[PDB]
Design an enzyme around this catalytic site. Structure first.
Site, PDB file in Angstrom:
ATOM      1  N   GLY A  90       2.486   2.955  11.262  1.00 57.12           N
ATOM      2  CA  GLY A  90       3.211   1.843  10.678  1.00 57.12           C
ATOM      3  C   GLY A  90       4.529   2.221  10.074  1.00 57.12           C
ATOM      4  CD1 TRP A 128      -3.337   6.227   0.362  1.00 57.06           C
ATOM      5  CD2 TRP A 128      -2.952   4.497  -0.977  1.00 57.06           C
ATOM      6  NE1 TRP A 128      -3.064   6.737  -0.881  1.00 57.06           N
ATOM      7  CE2 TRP A 128      -2.826   5.695  -1.729  1.00 57.06           C
ATOM      8  CE3 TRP A 128      -2.749   3.267  -1.617  1.00 57.06           C
ATOM      9  CZ2 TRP A 128      -2.508   5.701  -3.095  1.00 57.06           C
ATOM     10  CZ3 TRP A 128      -2.430   3.258  -2.953  1.00 57.06           C
ATOM     11  CH2 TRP A 128      -2.314   4.478  -3.689  1.00 57.06           C
ATOM     12  CG  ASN A 129       2.452   2.054   2.687  1.00 56.31           C
ATOM     13  OD1 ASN A 129       2.491   2.233   3.902  1.00 56.31           O
ATOM     14  ND2 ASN A 129       2.575   0.858   2.126  1.00 56.31           N
ATOM     15  CE  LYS A 183       8.002  -1.648  11.512  1.00 56.60           C
ATOM     16  NZ  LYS A 183       6.826  -1.646  10.595  1.00 56.60           N
ATOM     17  CG  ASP A 241       4.832  -6.614   7.924  1.00 51.01           C
ATOM     18  OD1 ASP A 241       4.892  -7.039   9.107  1.00 51.01           O
ATOM     19  OD2 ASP A 241       4.927  -5.378   7.678  1.00 51.01           O
ATOM     20  CG  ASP A 242      10.805  -8.599   8.936  1.00 55.43           C
ATOM     21  OD1 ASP A 242      11.425  -9.690   8.869  1.00 55.43           O
ATOM     22  OD2 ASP A 242      11.447  -7.535   9.040  1.00 55.43           O
ATOM     23  CG  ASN A 290       2.332   3.858   7.194  1.00 55.96           C
ATOM     24  OD1 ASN A 290       2.506   4.121   8.388  1.00 55.96           O
ATOM     25  ND2 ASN A 290       3.295   3.377   6.436  1.00 55.96           N
ATOM     26  CG  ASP A 345       8.715   4.868   6.085  1.00 54.99           C
ATOM     27  OD1 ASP A 345       8.622   4.884   4.842  1.00 54.99           O
ATOM     28  OD2 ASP A 345       8.164   4.010   6.800  1.00 54.99           O
TER      29      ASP A 345
HETATM   30  F1  LIG Z   1      14.480  -1.772   5.248  1.00 54.58           F
HETATM   31  C1  LIG Z   1      13.834  -0.978   6.314  1.00 54.58           C
HETATM   32  F2  LIG Z   1      12.870  -1.722   6.762  1.00 54.58           F
HETATM   33  F3  LIG Z   1      14.758  -0.668   7.512  1.00 54.58           F
HETATM   34  C2  LIG Z   1      13.273   0.254   5.759  1.00 54.58           C
HETATM   35  N1  LIG Z   1      12.469   0.080   4.646  1.00 54.58           N
HETATM   36  C3  LIG Z   1      11.654   1.009   3.836  1.00 54.58           C
HETATM   37  C4  LIG Z   1      12.434   2.308   3.732  1.00 54.58           C
HETATM   38  N2  LIG Z   1      12.313   3.093   5.029  1.00 54.58           N
HETATM   39  C5  LIG Z   1      13.151   2.795   6.043  1.00 54.58           C
HETATM   40  C6  LIG Z   1      13.592   1.509   6.390  1.00 54.58           C
END
Ligand SMILES: FC(F)(F)C1=NCCNC=C1
Length: 580
Positions: A149, A357-358, A180, A259-260, A391, A363
Site C-alpha cells: 500500500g 498498520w502503517n 500504485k 480513501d481518495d 503496510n 514512504d
Molecule cells: F501525498 C502523497 F500521496 F503523494 C504522499 N503522501 C504520504 C507521504 N508519502 C508520499 C506521498
C-alpha cells in the site's frame, strides 16, 4: 546428547519437549501423502529434496517415518503416532505435530493447518536432527498479512514471489495486492488485465495459493467512479466485469478502497459494497468476505468528542455486517493502538475490525529504514480485531524484520514480547551476521517526520540512557571516566559492525541499507570525537579539543545533509548535544 528446540516463528501455542531428539535417516517413509493437502505435501517434498533426504517407495522399518494428513482424513497410523495429541478440537488453521521415537506426525485441523505444520517441521530440523516435541498450535487472529500500500518504487515481480513464500513460511495468510505502479488497480480500474499482463498476474495468484495466501485484489475506483443513474449502473457493471475477469484467473478475495475520492458520500460507497457483496461475493459462494477501506479510516478523521462524524456514522449503519472494515489506529501513523481505541471503533462499526498498520512503511520519510518490531499494539486487540495487516517498505528485503514480528504478534498475541520477537527475527533471518545486524538495526526502529507521523520502538534506548547519565555525571562534577571508557567501546562496536555488514551482507539486503550503514558509521565517528572533546576539556587542553570539535562538526554536517537518516535522537543528537 540432547537436541535443543531451535528458534521458531511464530511461537507455537503449546510445545512440550518429550525426548532427547533423534537423527532423521538418509531417507524416509512418507505416509498419508496421497490424502493430505497437496500444497503441504509439495512444501514437504521441496524441503526434503533441498536437504538430500530421499523418500523410500518401499516401507523400510530402519527408516524415519513421516505421517501427514488432516483430521477429516481417515489415516489410522497418524492417530497412532500422535499418541494422544489431536488437532480435532482446534480452530481453523490449527495443527498438531508430534516427533518421537523415530516418527514425525503432522495432523492439520484443515489443509492450511497441515501446511503450517510442515512450516514448523521445517524450522525444527537442523543438520538432520529434530527434537522430540509435542505441539498443538493455532492463530490468535485469523487474517494475518501484508497490504502492498506504500508509495515509491514498487516491488518487483521477483520481490513479490519472494515475499509470498516468506509469508507462507511464517504462517501469514493474506496479501493485499494494491500497488500504485499498477494502472489496472486505480487509473484504468474498469478494464481487465490485457493479455500481456495475464501471465504475471497468474504467477502471483498461483504462488499465493501454493503457500496458503489469500491473494486479495485491491481496487480503488475513487479516481473517477460515477454513482448516479445510468452512469452509476454502467460503472457498477464495470466493477463486476473487472472482478469476474479476476475471478476467472483464480482470485477469490477482493478489497474496495474509498480513501481518495471526489464524491465523498458514505451512503453511496456502502451501496456499491452491499450490492457487489450480494451480486458477486455471495453469488459465487467461494469468495472470501469483501474488504473495504472507507474515506475516513483513522480515529482522528472518524470520531469527534467520542461521537462518529457524519461519514463514519452513515457508512457504519449502511455497510453490510459481513464486510471487513479497515482502519489504521488513532491516526494514520501513530505510536499505539490501545484497547480503548479498538473498542471505540469496533463499537461504532459493530463488528470485529480490520487493522491496516502503517509500520514499517517509510514512504513518508524515505531516508530512514524501519527495522523494529511490532510495537504499541495492545496484546488484547484480538478482542476487537480479527484481520491484521502491515503496510511495509518499498525495501522488501529489510521489511522482513518487522514482518517476521507481525507474524508472531498476529499468531500468538498473548505471548508477544516485542524485544524477544525482534531478536528472534534478526537471529532467524541474518544467521552468522545477526549479532552485527542487531547493533545496526538497533539504531533504526523509530519513525518520526516531526509533523504528523510517529511510530515504533525508540532508537537504541540503553545507549540513550548512558548518554543522559554521562551528562548528569559531568554537570554535577561526579567522576565519569568508567562510563566514558564504556561509551568509547560502544561507538567502536557500532563502527566495527556496520563495516562488517558492508563487507559481508548479501546484495539483496546490502543494497537497501548501504547508505544508512555509511550514515551510522559517520555518526559513530562523530560520537567518538564528541567524547574526545569531553576528555580534552576535563584535561584543560584547547589543542585536543579544537581538533576534536572540528572532526565532530565534520561528521555531523555529512550526516545532516546526506539523504540517509538514522539514530536521530541518539547517535546524531549526542553530537549536537556535545557541540552546545
Ligand atoms: F501525498 C502523497 F500521496 F503523494 C504522499 N503522501 C504520504 C507521504 N508519502 C508520499 C506521498
Amino acid at each position: 546428547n540432547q537436541v535443543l528446540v531451535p528458534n521458531l516463528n511464530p511461537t507455537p501455542e503449546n510445545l512440550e519437549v518429550v525426548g532427547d531428539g533423534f537423527k532423521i535417516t538418509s531417507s524416509i517413509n512418507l505416509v498419508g501423502e496421497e490424502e493430505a493437502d497437496e500444497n503441504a505435501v509439495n512444501a514437504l517434498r521441496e524441503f526434503l529434496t533441498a536437504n538430500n533426504i530421499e523418500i523410500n517407495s518401499e516401507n523400510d522399518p530402519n527408516s524415519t517415518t513421516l505421517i501427514i494428513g488432516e483430521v477429516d482424513d481417515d489415516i489410522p497410523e497418524l492417530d497412532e503416532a500422535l499418541n494422544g495429541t489431536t488437532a480435532e478440537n482446534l480452530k481453523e488453521e490449527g495443527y498438531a505435530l508430534v516427533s518421537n521415537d523415530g516418527k514425525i506426525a503432522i495432523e492439520g485441523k484443515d489443509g492450511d493447518g497441515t501446511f503450517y505444520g510442515v512450516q514448523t517441521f521445517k524450522q525444527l530440523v537442523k543438520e538432520s536432527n529434530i527434537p522430540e516435541v509435542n505441539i498443538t498450535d493455532y492463530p490468535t487472529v485469523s487474517a494475518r498479512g501484508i497490504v502492498e500500500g506504500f508509495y515509491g518504487t514498487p516491488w518487483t515481480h521477483q520481490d513479490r514471489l519472494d515475499q509470498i513464500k516468506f509469508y507462507g513460511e511464517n504462517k501469514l495468510n493474506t496479501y493485499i495486492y494494491a500497488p500504485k505502479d499498477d494502472p489496472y488497480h486505480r487509473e484504468k480500474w474498469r478494464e481487465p488485465y490485457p493479455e500481456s499482463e495475464m501471465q504475471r498476474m497468474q504467477e502471483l495468484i498461483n504462488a499465493s495459493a501454493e503457500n496458503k495466501v489469500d491473494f486479495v485484489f485491491g481496487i480503488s475506483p475513487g479516481i473517477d467512479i460515477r454513482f448516479d443513474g445510468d452512469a452509476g449502473e454502467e460503472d457498477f457493471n464495470h466493477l463486476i466485469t473487472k472482478a469476474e475477469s479476476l475471478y476467472d484467473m483464480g482470485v477469490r478475495s477482493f478489497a474496495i478502497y474509498w480513501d481518495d475520492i471526489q464524491d465523498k458520500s458514505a451512503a453511496k460507497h456502502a451501496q456499491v459494497l452491499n450490492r457487489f457483496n450480494e451480486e458477486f461475493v455471495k453469488a459465487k459462494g467461494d469468495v472470501k468476505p469483501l474488504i473495504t477501506v472507507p474515506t475516513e479510516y483513522d480515529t482522528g478523521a472518524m470520531v469527534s468528542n467520542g461521537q462518529p462524524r457524519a461519514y463514519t456514522r452513515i457508512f457504519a449503519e449502511t455497510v453490510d455486517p459481513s464486510i471487513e472494515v479497515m482502519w489504521t489506529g488513532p491516526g494514520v501513523v501513530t505510536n499505539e493502538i490501545p484497547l480503548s481505541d479498538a473498542q471505540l471503533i469496533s463499537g461504532i462499526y459493530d463488528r470485529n475490525m480490520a487493522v491496516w498498520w502503517n509500520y514499517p512503511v517509510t514512504d513518508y520519510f524515505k531516508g530512514k529504514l524501519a527495522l523494529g518490531p511490532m510495537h504499541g499494539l495492545d496484546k488484547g486487540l484480538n478482542q476487537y480485531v480479527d484481520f491484521f495487516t502491515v503496510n511495509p517498505m518499498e525495501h522488501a528485503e529489510l521489511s522482513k524484520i518487522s514482518i517476521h514480528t507481525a507474524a508472531d504478534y498476529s499468531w500468538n498475541m498473548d505471548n508477544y514480547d516485542y524485544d524477544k520477537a525482534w531478536n528472534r527475527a534478526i537471529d532467524m533471518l541474518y544467521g552468522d551476521l545477526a549479532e552485527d545486524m542487531k547493533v545496526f538495526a538497533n539504531h533504526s526502529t523509530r519513525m518520526d517526520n516531526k509533523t504528523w507521523a510517529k511510530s515504533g520502538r525508540e532508537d537504541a534506548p540503553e545507549l540513550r540512557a548512558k548518554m543522559d547519565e554521562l551528562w548528569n555525571k559531568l554537570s554535577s562534577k561526579e567522576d565519569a571516566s568508567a562510563l566514558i571508557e564504556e561509551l568509547y567501546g560502544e561507538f567502536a562496536r557500532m563502527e566495527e559492525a556496520c563495516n562488517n555488514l558492508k563487507a559481508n551482507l548479501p546484495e539483496v539486503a546490502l543494497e537497501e541499507c548501504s547508505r544508512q550503514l555509511d550514515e551510522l558509521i559517520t555518526l559513530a565517528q562523530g560520537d567518538k570525537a564528541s567524547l574526545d572533546m569531553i576528555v580534552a576539556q576535563l584535561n584543560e587542553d584547547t589543542e585536543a579539543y579544537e581538533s576534536a570539535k572540528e572532526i565532530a562538526q565534520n561528521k555531523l554536517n555529512t550526516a545532516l545533509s546526506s539523504f540517509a537518516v538514522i539514530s536521530e535522537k541518539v547517535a546524531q543528537s549526542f553530537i549536537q548535544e556535545a557541540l552546545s
